[PDB]
Amino acid sequence: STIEEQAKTFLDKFNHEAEDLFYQSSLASWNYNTNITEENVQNMNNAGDKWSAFLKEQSTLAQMYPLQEIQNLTVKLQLQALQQNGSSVLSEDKSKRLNTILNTMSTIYSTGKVCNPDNPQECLLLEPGLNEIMANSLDYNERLWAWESWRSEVGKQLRPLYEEYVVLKNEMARANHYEDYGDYWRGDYEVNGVDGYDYSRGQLIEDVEHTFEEIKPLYEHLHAYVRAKLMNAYPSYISPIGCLPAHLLGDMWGRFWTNLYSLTVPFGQKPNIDVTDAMVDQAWDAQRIFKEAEKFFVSVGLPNMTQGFWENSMLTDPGNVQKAVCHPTAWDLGKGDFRILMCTKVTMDDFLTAHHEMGHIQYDMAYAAQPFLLRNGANEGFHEAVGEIMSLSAATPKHLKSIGLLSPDFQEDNETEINFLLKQALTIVGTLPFTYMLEKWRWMVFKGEIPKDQWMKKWWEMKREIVGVVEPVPHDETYCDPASLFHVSNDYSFIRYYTRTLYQFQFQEALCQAAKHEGPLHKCDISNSTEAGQKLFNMLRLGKSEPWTLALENVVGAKNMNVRPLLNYFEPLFTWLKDQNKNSFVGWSTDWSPY
Template identity: 70%
Template sequence: MLVHFWLLCGLSAVVTPQDVTQEAQTFLAEFNARAEDISYENSLASWDYNTNITEETARKMSEAGTKWAAFYEEASRNASRFSLADIQDAATRLQIQSLQDRGSSVLVFLMGYLTSNLQLNSVMNSMSTIYSTGIVCKATEPFDCLVLEPGLDDIMANSIDYHERLWAWEGWRADIGRMMRPLYEEYVELKNEAARLNNYSDYGDYWRANYETDYPEEYKYSRDQLVQDVEKTFEQIKPLYQQLHAYVRHRLEQVYGSELINPTGCLPAHLLGDMWGRFWTNLYNLTVPYPDKPNIDVTSAMVQKNWDALKIFKTAEAFFVSIGLYNMTAGFWTNSMLTEPTDNRKVVCHPTAWDMGKNDYRIKMCTKVTMDDFLTAHHEMGHIEYDMAYSVQPFLLRDGANEGFHEAVGEIMSLSAATPQHLKSLDLLEPTFQEDEETEINFLLKQALTIVGTMPFTYMLEKWRWMVFNGEITKQEWTKRWWEMKREIVGVVEPVPHDETYCDPAALFHVANDYSFIRYYTRTIYQFQFQEALCKAANHTGPLHKCDITNSTAAGGNLRQLLELGKSKPWTQALESATGEKYMNATPLLHYFEPLFNWLQKNNSGRSIGWNTDWTPYSDNAIKVRISLKAALGDNAYVWDANELFLFKSSIAYAMRKYFAEEKKQNVDFQVTDIHVGEETQRVSFYFTVSMPGNVSDIVPRADVESAIRMSRGRISEAFRLDDNTLEFEGIVPTLATPYEPPVTIWLIVFGVVMSLIVIGVIVLIITARERANEAGANCEVNPYDEDGRSNKGFELSEETQTSF
């Protein structure tokens, strides 16, 4: 047992706040001692898996994770026995409050939830493995395959071949994203279940609680305030982003042509510098404003001067030491994985910093000799510096003031490391390099591609997840809403249609590995607030974007004070102590990029600012389908689901094969994977395109697809028990084929028999009435007006009288 029996019994007899505080401190002392060991075991098992992905290391990681969760759940339940109101010491109160949040471990020992916890671990391990080991193979050469890193990432970073990029982009999502879909659906359900057991409304609400502070009063901050501040700062940044978007669109149009880049539309998602369009850094060579100026991307200089991964990280360490922060430990250099292993191990290449515990710090990164990785090394080492600084805090307070703070610290260092002044000091720019207005714009554009370009991406992704977790977006429209929001908020469009079998968000590391993502938005706001304050401490004069705090121990001392606090103070208080402000403010960011914003406004004169969300790269060849099941089949209508969509794709593939064989005299093996469906609605409508087998870039012209549909339209409709009016291909005139007639039900037969008997009865009554009238004719009074040619209506039998049933 974590807490001795006497302690728990004694707790019930406590009557004074002082006694409660002392008991809580005793409880925490025992927790801290055991937590150090069990957490370290868990970290080691996770490290072993991430640096050597096998079934064995996955099993051991799961076992260690379950052991930690069980320990933490028991400690959390025991911590819940303390009343926070009765704890007088602020640090003790904060630790108990933190421990009372049980996280996903709440699923472990609550009755009936053990299976759910094991299931959640299995789902998360599976997603991580799929992501880390995923490959994309060429359709015509199934053994010619590429992993994400290194392989696909190189194509997405360097290729300017529209179709090669599309092959890599679509392949990653069609294979890895689709495999993730059923797992991510389970993940959402299980994470929501855990959040609700922790008294949160959903898992997004749980994530936002990381920013919540409730003590002391003047530094309170709510989850709702986070949402409001994110939306407010996004509106502040939007004009700058729209100008950047318009400029990038114009330059990409010059590269790819107006048939692939619409001058007023969204940007195709596969052209934006990496697999996800998250960072636009690699677009710099295509968009540099003044290409004749010396290149401030120093990748080529690093290669020429024989830099390697070790030199990159040693240089980053020297920067931190120069401002009075920490050297890396000896164990850091021994235990870290700074390059991809050459022994054929499968590893998670995504860069991460690890505070293992017990003074064991590591970085895992498949470093390449590029400027981008040079800056990433500063970012990851910034995490380690933060970890080292707050190691003096109790176990539960060894964390960033909030998740965004942790991310921001590394980014502050990247701001200084990227300046031409700093690069020149490292002999990566020529000694004769001179800064002028043009080199300044080149530098700021490069910074904006990385920093400003990613902010709508980050905001939109997390907004989508929040809406998924709270049920505002149902799983029947995950993909549809993902791309609608991507178009509306980011100005980015899918290059091919995607249906609800895809899970495009989970094709990103952070989504597949259960990371809150709003941290990457808040960190960008914080980093410029911090940078502005540190530059003042360093006595920097001039524009903010020219500030380099290298060698400023005054700036480093201020930063160190902030880092050492860890989570011991509310983040609002920590931010105020460092910057003078309690809350997020985008103004320093806008100051940093102000010269670029002014330049973009002039350069974009005459161009469309903003984007038309209707245009897509496949619009000209897409066909819209509307299906009316209820109108056609009434109460016998079936549910349209993934199986029906598969049948539709199969029917179109059949039609394409038949058309090519009979009309073009070609045997073309169309498959369901060559039929691309998107923009599905629950009323059953969608768009689709057809590509040639194995080549998503080779779109079959709409005219050929229409001809194929006409040739096989009857067979297609028959497969769904519909006709041309209830399975409508927009723009294709209905055929004259006999419409499908649904089987007659029993009640219709009975109704018909009854109606027939009634009709026969009426006819008999009419005939009988006429015979009686004829017999009485001799006695009938003659019309007195007959000879005058006038009629007496009282004597006429109207032939227009109808019997209504």
């Protein structure tokens, strides 16, 4: 008779119908990805349209239920997650215009070509040409030309599209009782109705700024070291006082500094830990890789894999007759079925990727004990963190020598340790200031603190002040440089990467402290630690039913994210960088420019 009973009945009906509907949709998507043809695409499109129509109908039906009269936290969270009427509050014409803008931006970013000025008969594409030039090429002029072409041929075409997209998103957010679109994105981190575990929206920004201010010295030392190393390859291109150029960061946008490992290697006389030869001489295969991963996961304390996972997944390339996408993705069918789509080859990188995918599948099976609206992680960065902690624990030399890949007589030299720490730094922390700057710029452009005639101006100001990157040539208001990224041109959040970067180190420190292991954090192994496995499963079981702060306090002991694990993980690397930067000038100055 009460509203709560009707809400529970509606939630049961939804968990009955939408479960099977999403299961059929995921089966269609799996048949399309594992078999590209003209019928699977139509089946997947029909399934997606039916699923979207069903979600719209269920949301319009649930909107007639008040949220203030519900006293159950689970029912309230499910109703809040179900009543998300984002793309339906605006007018039909405005919605069609926003969809057209999204589609044309996606087509411009994907189908974006640029031709050489001296060879008009052959043009260069993004993936084969631009990434190759920004990664494996060392010529200053070639990289500068490629960066300028990528920022001009695509950036200028997206200026009015982005100017209309930001306004449409702000209007949609104001229609959904939000302040701005950045506020709508931060609302995913908002949790209410629990005493002591509440988390506002500005508190997220405050915590991110505090963590960035605490991690600033390590990034400054790393940037100084990278600049000192790059001054050798570029004698008259980079100054020892100014910031690094934008097209000399090993990436099209300067996000990841992994490609700069060949130039910033601490000790080039000792090669990195590579077990590829030891893996190919022992007659390994993808099946053996997944078996060893399952053995590791069951030694940690997690259950085995389902029989369907072994009798239905495609762990190897089918061949040339059947076409499939070779992108590692974790598939959650919903009805107790879990598969992995990955063209797994014999490689240590593929080994870590398989461990990451198996950790994703383990998290899926862990939260599968909850309703459909709750079958998800506590936040948009928990899944990636749980995968990355396993990928890091599997890449330790102790685990490699215990499996059988690394020889037991191999000694642990500190030079290889410093090289591995520098690689991990360049691949993890190198994108944290860029992520923070991009997220703050998007938040301030959605809230309205940045005038329309100062977008790129303030963007470059922040990229030179906050980050150690300076633009080579001046770009006026027509070169929309920020819109040249995939996550910004396809309506995807970016703070999730910073959150998962914090969460992975927090989880690593927690599981290493619970494993009764002493020494460095990067050389910590949790393979035969059942206590850490149980403590992690206690958090993976909560899923989305409990707030993320409670899950954190259950897994690490704190209700707020901290950057101290990240600093403790690179403490020997921090000491080495401080010892190697005695004569170098730590920091950067915003007055220098390559103009």
